[PDB]
Scaffold this active site. Structure first.
Site, short mmCIF file in Angstrom:
data_model
loop_
_atom_site.label_atom_id
_atom_site.label_comp_id
_atom_site.label_asym_id
_atom_site.label_seq_id
_atom_site.Cartn_x
_atom_site.Cartn_y
_atom_site.Cartn_z
N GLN A 205 0.81 -1.20 0.00
CA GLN A 205 0.00 0.00 0.00
C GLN A 205 0.85 1.25 0.00
O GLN A 205 1.84 1.27 0.75
CB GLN A 205 -0.89 -0.02 1.23
N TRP A 206 0.58 2.22 -0.87
CA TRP A 206 1.22 3.52 -0.69
C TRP A 206 0.18 4.64 -0.90
O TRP A 206 -0.22 4.92 -2.01
CB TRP A 206 2.47 3.72 -1.59
N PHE A 207 -0.19 5.26 0.21
CA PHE A 207 -1.11 6.37 0.22
C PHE A 207 -0.26 7.59 0.41
O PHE A 207 0.39 7.75 1.46
CB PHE A 207 -2.17 6.20 1.33
N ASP B 158 8.21 -2.33 4.18
CA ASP B 158 9.43 -2.69 4.91
C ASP B 158 9.51 -4.13 5.40
O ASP B 158 10.43 -4.48 6.13
CB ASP B 158 9.64 -1.73 6.07
N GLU C 160 -0.33 -6.29 15.39
CA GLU C 160 0.05 -5.16 14.54
C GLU C 160 -0.65 -5.29 13.22
O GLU C 160 -1.09 -6.34 12.88
CB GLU C 160 1.55 -5.17 14.29
N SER D 186 11.61 -0.70 9.06
CA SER D 186 11.65 0.67 9.33
C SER D 186 12.01 0.88 10.79
O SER D 186 12.53 1.92 11.11
CB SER D 186 10.29 1.37 9.07
N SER E 188 10.70 5.38 10.72
CA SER E 188 9.32 5.28 10.20
C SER E 188 9.16 6.27 9.07
O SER E 188 9.73 7.38 9.06
CB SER E 188 8.37 5.67 11.29
O1 LIG Z 1 2.93 8.16 3.82
C1 LIG Z 1 2.66 6.94 4.12
C2 LIG Z 1 3.39 6.28 5.10
C3 LIG Z 1 3.14 4.97 5.33
N1 LIG Z 1 2.18 4.32 4.58
C4 LIG Z 1 1.81 2.89 4.75
O2 LIG Z 1 2.22 2.53 6.08
C5 LIG Z 1 3.09 1.38 6.01
C6 LIG Z 1 4.00 1.36 7.23
O3 LIG Z 1 4.99 2.38 7.09
P1 LIG Z 1 6.28 2.24 8.04
O4 LIG Z 1 6.74 0.80 8.03
O5 LIG Z 1 7.15 3.25 7.52
O6 LIG Z 1 5.65 2.68 9.45
P2 LIG Z 1 5.74 2.13 10.95
O7 LIG Z 1 6.43 0.80 10.96
O8 LIG Z 1 6.46 3.21 11.64
O9 LIG Z 1 4.31 1.95 11.37
C7 LIG Z 1 3.80 1.58 4.64
O10 LIG Z 1 4.29 0.30 4.18
C8 LIG Z 1 2.62 2.01 3.81
O11 LIG Z 1 1.74 0.99 3.41
C9 LIG Z 1 1.53 5.02 3.55
O12 LIG Z 1 0.70 4.40 2.83
N2 LIG Z 1 1.79 6.28 3.34
MN LIG Z 2 7.54 -0.42 9.66
#
Ligand SMILES: O=c1ccn([C@@H]2O[C@H](COP(=O)(O)OP(=O)(O)O)[C@@H](O)[C@H]2O)c(=O)[nH]1
Ligand SMILES: [Mn+2]
Ligand SMILES: [Mn+2]
Length: 306
Positions: free
Chosen positions: A25-27, A202, A229, A298, A303
């Site tokens: 997912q990428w929002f 990640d 999670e 991450s 993050s």
């Molecule tokens: O601008 C963003 C940032 C994060 N994500 C989604 O959130 C997930 C988790 O991001 P990350 O692992 O960086 O976050 P954390 O582990 O800190 O929750 C990413 O793979 C994306 O699917 C997104 O869609 N847009």
């Molecule tokens: Mn992460």
């Protein structure tokens, strides 16, 4: 083994065959931070997420890989995404704007009014007056600002991580069928009503996943402090009843959270409705395990949003 037991019931370990698509997912809240012929998915040293997805698609050559996207992308950016699809034939870019979620939605007034009614029916000496006051205030604010606000319209890009968290669970309700609904080509060998393996970008694949076997066809990421999670969510079918259970919570609770209520309570209340087991045991039961994923990387760099 081919079965597991939890809270006194037996669940078969159901297969997710090697067909079942992976979905990332990428929002993107600020697509103008990318060049206008650039793929608008983060790809920095600390968050090399587009590369990770590509590496996964290379590993899993034979399996469909979805990239579930949203944001105000340019024409140039949509074309660069098309071009990624041309280059890795198993990648399918799914625009959130091409999917219909109205069958899962509810108006916020409705939710607030149902809760206010219920609270006001309780005696003054019984009830949570602070909550009753808070819900009344939220109802006043929605009527002033946008009376037609819904759960789904409310979890928009101005809500930070709630945007992606909410729509991730909606996607998982649709499952594989989302590829078809969005008109993606070359998806006709997906199983109708089939599932998907959602992964955070990640979650690094170091080899092929193969066939998975999950209790009642569902599993999710557990971090170890031990917590459920949302960075991995795998289902073998559409509208998994545990996820439907969590949506019912979102439709009943004022302030339902996609992680804490929909995902975490939904799944736990579905599998241990009478609360006869430890949260930790539930975590062991639901845990998605795989030796060929390095999870939540991450957390060892930074993050991409916190
Ligand atoms: O601008 C963003 C940032 C994060 N994500 C989604 O959130 C997930 C988790 O991001 P990350 O692992 O960086 O976050 P954390 O582990 O800190 O929750 C990413 O793979 C994306 O699917 C997104 O869609 N847009
Ligand atoms: Mn992460
Ligand atoms: Mn504990």
């Amino acid at each position: 083994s081919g079965h597991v037991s939890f809270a006194g019931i037996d669940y078969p370990l159901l297969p997710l065959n090697h067909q079942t698509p992976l979905v990332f997912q990428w929002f993107e809240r600020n697509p103008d931070r990318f060049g206008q012929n650039e793929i608008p998915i983060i790809n920095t040293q600390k968050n090399p997420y587009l590369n990770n997805i590509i590496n996964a698609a290379i590993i899993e050559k034979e399996r469909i890989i979805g990239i579930f996207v949203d944001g105000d992308f340019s024409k140039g950016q949509r074309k660069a995404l098309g071009k990624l699809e041309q280059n890795y034939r198993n990648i399918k870019v799914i625009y959130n704007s091409d999917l219909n979620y109205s069958m899962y939605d509810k108006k916020l007034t409705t939710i607030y009014l149902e809760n206010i009614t219920k609270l006001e029916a309780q005696s003054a000496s019984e009830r949570d007056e602070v909550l009753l006051n808070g819900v009344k205030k939220s109802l006043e604010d929605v009527l002033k600002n946008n009376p037609e606000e819904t759960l789904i319209s409310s979890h928009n890009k101005d809500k930070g991580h709630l945007w992606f968290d909410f729509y991730r669970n909606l996607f998982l309700l649709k499952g594989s069928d989302a590829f078809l609904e969005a008109g993606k080509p070359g998806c006709h060998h997906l199983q109708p009503g089939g599932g998907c393996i959602y992964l955070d970008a990640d979650m690094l694949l170091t080899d092929k996943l193969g066939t998975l076997y999950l209790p009642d066809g569902i599993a999710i990421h557990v971090s170890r402090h031990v917590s459920l999670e949302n960075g991995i969510i795998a289902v073998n079918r559409s509208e998994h009843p545990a996820l439907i259970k969590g949506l019912e919570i979102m439709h009943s609770k004022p302030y339902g959270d996609p992680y804490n209520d929909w995902l975490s309570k939904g799944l736990r209340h579905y599998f241990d409705g009478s609360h006869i087991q430890d949260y930790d045991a539930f975590c062991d039961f639901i845990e998605f395990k795989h030796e060929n994923i390095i999870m939540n990387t991450s957390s060892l760099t930074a993050s991409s949003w916190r």
